[PDB]
């Protein structure tokens, strides 16, 4: 998953715009911090192209 | 024993506490204050006390509820807040803990209250470590567990709230309001004992030590009375387990503190004490205040000791609630209830 998320971000992110592009790459599943987790809803960071991560 | 003192910070604190003694409120002060019925007489008697200083400044004859709240702000900042800054060492740490100990219960009440919509910044009277413009509103506005961490780190020393906060993150008590509060009260008794345990080679505690143990006992009984008529949820932490090694044991204190009303623990708890653990709310409340307030007054005769400063904080909360009860009744021409029944406040 980690590798997937990165390759798409690198490749397509440019289409959304440079302003849109933020680096906070990585993922923390433990409750130690709440940074590093993409979602357009939060002002903390944003997805840089229409991407949703679905976890069943 | 005693008399091996050389603490810079505790002398400074004690001098301030003694200057206050000159104007302190007493059982005598309350006994005269109940008799009143006229607005003017009450006013006059109170004016020479520490709380009385505030009324002299602004002479007010309505004695409304709001008036009492302003008075508490001014006094709490002056007596408690300012002095801690000017302290250091284990005298600062110890003093900050006991004050923070009240804090633990209040913060939770502001946060849950916020989800429900209570007040976003307004906090009311009670012994506290910080004012209504330092840390407590930042704590109040937040509804999430995370934010509570970030705020706590800012004020040093690190609050006992930090540890309490990890346990409550994992839901060991749930979101049911009572189960939370009962766990924070078990924690509050537990940490105080430990801080005492460190401090003991230098002062001499008889009265203090016996009273702290009785305070615990009364709390255990309070948690039982409350959770009675609604069942006690024993899997979660809602009942006190406390180091005892006398009549009671860890096993005993746990039976007593739950809703069970088990007599054999009760026989251990009192035999000659007026409080025994009744299913009557009112009777226990009268007794609790008198018992708790004695040992603290006897303790004031000790000086330049870790023992004296504890007693003084503990007296000031009981004092706050009393004053509140008297000033409100006279404003609206009626007598008091609780203040009139007990003669030791």
């Amino acid at each position: 998953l980690s590798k997937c998320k990165s390759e798409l971000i690198d490749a397509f992110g440019f289409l959304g715009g440079n302003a849109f592009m933020k680096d906070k790459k990585g993922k923390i599943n433990k409750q130690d911090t709440s940074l590093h987790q993409y979602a357009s809803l939060v002002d903390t960071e944003y997805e840089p192209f229409v991407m949703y991560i679905i976890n069943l | 024993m005693e008399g091996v003192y050389f603490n810079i910070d505790n002398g400074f604190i004690e001098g301030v506490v003694r200057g206050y003694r000159n104007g302190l409120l007493s059982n005598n002060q309350y006994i005269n204050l109940t008799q009143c019925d006229t607005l003017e007489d009450l006013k006059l008697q109170l004016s020479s006390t520490d709380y009385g200083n505030f009324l002299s400044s602004v002479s007010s004859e309505s004695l409304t509820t709001s008036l009492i709240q302003e008075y508490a702000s001014s006094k709490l900042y002056h007596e408690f807040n300012y002095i801690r800054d000017q302290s250091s060492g284990s005298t600062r740490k110890f003093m900050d803990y006991i004050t923070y100990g009240y804090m633990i219960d209040n913060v939770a009440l502001m946060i849950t209250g916020t989800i429900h919509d209570r007040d976003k910044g307004e906090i009311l009277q009670r012994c506290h470590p910080l004012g209504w413009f330092d840390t407590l509103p930042t704590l109040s506005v937040a509804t999430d567990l995370e934010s509570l961490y970030e705020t706590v780190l800012v004020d040093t020393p690190l609050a006992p709230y930090f540890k309490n906060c990890f346990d409550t993150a994992e839901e060991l008590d749930d979101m049911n309001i009572e189960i939370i509060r009962n766990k924070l009260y078990k924690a509050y008794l537990e940490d105080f004992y430990n801080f005492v345990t460190e401090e003991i080679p230098e002062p001499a505690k008889e009265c203090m030590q016996t009273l702290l143990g009785f305070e615990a006992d009364r709390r255990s009984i309070n948690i039982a009375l409350n959770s009675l008529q609604s069942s006690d949820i024993d899997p979660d932490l809602k009942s006190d387990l406390l180091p005892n090694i006398g009549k009671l044991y860890p096993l005993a204190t746990f039976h007593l503190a739950q809703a069970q009303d088990f007599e054999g623990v009760r026989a251990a708890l009192a035999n000659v004490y007026e409080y025994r653990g009744f299913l009557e709310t009112g009777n226990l409340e009268d007794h609790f205040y008198q018992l708790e307030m004695e040992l603290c007054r006897d303790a004031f005769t000790q000086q330049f000791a870790i023992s004296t400063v504890w007693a003084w904080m503990k007296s000031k909360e009981q004092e706050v609630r009393n004053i509140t009860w008297i000033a409100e009744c006279i404003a609206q021409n009626q007598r008091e209830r609780i203040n009139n029944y007990i003669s030791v406040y």
């Binding site: - | 008399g3 003192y5 050389f6 810079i8 002398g11 400074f12 004690e14 001098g15 301030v16 003694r18 200057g19 206050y20 003694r21 000159n22 000086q303 330049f304």
Partner: protein, 150 residues
């Protein structure tokens, strides 16, 4: 020899007593001032008690200097050492008393400045612990020179 060390021992202990006294008391003064700033005239007096301990101490020390034998002996040293000790730790012991009674006394002064005088009286009782040592000390110094010099 040890006679010189006698001087030393005396000048240190009595400093410590009186220092300790003044330390504790002082913090009581500092503290009293913030709620009632005009009890200074009474408050200051505890400090001066512990200061007078040193002046008796000083006479002993100087005495010992003069009383040194030619190259001394093992026996000569030890009399002189013993005198030094006497005033020193009797000095410390009064000084310690004066700081603790004093400090509580200025908070005493805070609440009532009228029965402050009762506390002054306590203070004086502790100074006699110094005096009694001072007496001995003098007599020890004198014994060293006597016996056509020990």
């Amino acid at each position: 020899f040890f006679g010189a060390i006698g001087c030393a021992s005396a000048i240190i202990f009595t400093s410590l007593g009186a220092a300790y006294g003044t330390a504790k008391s002082g913090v009581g003064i500092c503290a009293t001032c913030v709620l009632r700033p005009d009890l200074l005239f009474k408050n200051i007096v505890p400090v001066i008690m512990a200061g007078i301990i040193a002046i008796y101490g000083l006479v002993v020390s100087v005495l010992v200097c003069y009383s040194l034998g030619q190259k001394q002996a093992l026996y000569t040293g030890f009399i002189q050492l013993g005198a030094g000790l006497s005033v020193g730790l009797s000095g410390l012991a009064a000084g310690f008393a004066i700081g603790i009674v004093g400090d509580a006394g200025v908070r005493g002064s805070s609440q009532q400045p009228r029965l402050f005088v009762g506390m002054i009286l306590i203070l004086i009782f502790a100074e006699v612990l110094g005096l009694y040592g001072l007496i001995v000390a003098l007599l020890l110094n004198s014994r060293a020179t006597q016996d056509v010099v020990c």
